[PDB]
Chains A and B, each alone.
Chain A
Amino acid sequence: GIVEQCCTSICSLYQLENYCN
């Protein structure tokens, strides 16, 4: 989920896009 995606690894610029859209 939102704060695991990128704190539990780096995550990407799309994966970090998928909060809005």
Chain B
Amino acid sequence: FVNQHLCGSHLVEALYLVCGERGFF
């Protein structure tokens, strides 16, 4: 986890690592 802002493109890493395997959007 992180406690910062993920201003689109970083989300995608914090998104890859969270929902990567299931995909997201």
> Could you tell me which A residues sit within 8 Å of B by CB distance?
2-3, 6-11, 13, 16-17, 19-21
- With contacts A13-B1, A19-B25, A21-B22 taken as known, whether A3 is within 8 angstroms of B15 at the C-beta atoms is no
- List A contacts of B6 (CB < 8 A): 3, 6-7, 11, 16
Please report B residues at the A interface, Cβ cutoff 8 Å.
1, 3-8, 11, 14-15, 18-19, 22-25
> A17 near B5 (CB under 8 angstroms)?
no
Interface of B is mostly: loop
How distant is the Cα of A9 from the Cα of B1 in the complex, in angstroms? 15
Closest Cβ of chain B: how far from A2's Cβ, in Å?
Answer: 7
| Least CB distance, B13 to chain A, in whole angstroms | 11
